[PDB]
Amino acid sequence: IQRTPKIQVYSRHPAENGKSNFLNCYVSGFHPSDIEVDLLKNGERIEKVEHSDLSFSKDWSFYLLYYTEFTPTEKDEYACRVNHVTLSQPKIVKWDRDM
């Protein structure tokens, strides 16, 4: 009756400090479709994040892409925060440029 989201946080282009890029949070495999996704910069919510239109896979589970322009640096930390009916608390996934 419910399926918890898979979460991937990653950049559109290989990350190069000082170079503009796109930060992506891809949530997939989840049901029902109500979901809350924030992109975080040093723990704080990034403001004007856009997302794809709701769609779904062959097994009917939903997926969404949340994305914002960003310019990475060596010190700035980025993450994605997801809440869903299946999660007792919001799940935070850190951006790791090696994943």
């Binding site: 009756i1 399926r3 898979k6 991937q8 990653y10 559109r12 282009h13 290989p14 796109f22 992506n24 891809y26 997939s28 495999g29 049901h31 029902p32 479709s33 109500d34 794809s52 239109d53 709701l54 769609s55 779904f56 009917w60 589970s61 939903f62 892409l65 994305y67 090696d98 994943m99």
Partner: protein, 276 residues
């Protein structure tokens, strides 16, 4: 090569917060080309690809009309399904529908689809014969009886063999620059020590289109299916997709591992290794 056109629809009720939200998107292969969202300020079918923008205003008026009509029918269907399943009016429920067609390299119909889900579970599906139905339960059997009465399958068959194939053909020609180009994966292997005893080899595929891809690790020529961590193929946001596969490797054994990549953008399957 082969191609597909698919329309996806999702209605989600929200008791106490207005009428159910309706979102439908249309795809050719892995390219989004139209959308409709009932929560938009002024809901219309909107283009999402350059090769559909040339369609005239009567096209956009028609597609908008069809989507609005489907939003309405979904809304009464959601009320019907509460009855079929003896459910209260308090909760949020979901109706999903997908339909479309697959065509081969010659543009001939490979097969069609039209299938539903209620609350994330299969509800009723048109069979591959495009003439009979598979109902998941006694509730869906009531829909089947109604749809057999009204000869719905015959209407769908005509569309799936007719307009679906013909307009997919048209779209493939108008967007041949992109729809008929495969972007092969850019591939490399990275190495991440875990401890004195182990490191992670991660095989990367980046920038590819369409999404379908095969990424595997072999050790001494043996598939490492059970020990390979394989992430879901993910959108980069620029039409292309990404994927990686990772194995944990005993130190000094890196050269026994080979990553294998198949993708329709590659003339021959690739083999790559960690290159220190």
């Amino acid at each position: 090569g082969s191609h597909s056109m698919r329309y996806f629809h999702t209605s989600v009720s929200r008791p106490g917060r207005g009428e159910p939200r309706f979102i439908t998107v249309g795809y050719v292969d892995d390219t989004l080309f139209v959308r409709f969202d009932s929560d938009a300020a002024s809901p219309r079918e909107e283009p999402r690809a350059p090769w559909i923008e040339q369609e005239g205003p009567e096209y956009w008026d028609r597609e908008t009309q069809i989507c609005k009509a489907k939003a309405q029918t979904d809304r009464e269907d959601l009320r019907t399904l509460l009855r079929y399943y003896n459910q209260s009016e308090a909760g949020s429920h979901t109706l999903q529908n997908m339909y479309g067609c697959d065509v081969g390299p010659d543009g001939r119909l490979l097969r069609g689809y039209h299938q539903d889900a209620y609350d994330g579970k299969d509800y009723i599906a048109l069979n591959e014969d495009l003439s009979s139905w598979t109902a998941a339960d006694t509730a869906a059997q009531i829909t089947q009886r109604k749809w057999e009465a009204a000869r719905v399958a015959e209407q769908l068959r005509a569309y799936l063999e007719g307009e679906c194939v013909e307009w997919l053909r048209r779209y493939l020609e108008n967007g041949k620059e992109t729809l008929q180009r495969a972007d092969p994966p850019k591939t490399h292997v990275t190495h991440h020590p875990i401890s004195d005893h182990e490191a992670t080899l991660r095989c990367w595929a980046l920038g590819f289109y369409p999404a379908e891809i095969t990424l595997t690790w072999q050790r001494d020529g043996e598939d490492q299916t059970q020990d390979t961590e394989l992430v879901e193929t993910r959108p980069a946001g620029d039409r292309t997709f990404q994927k990686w596969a990772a194995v944990v490797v005993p130190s000094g054994e890196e050269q026994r591992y080979t990553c294998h990549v198949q993708h329709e953008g590659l003339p021959k399957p690739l083999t790559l290794r960690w290159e220190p």
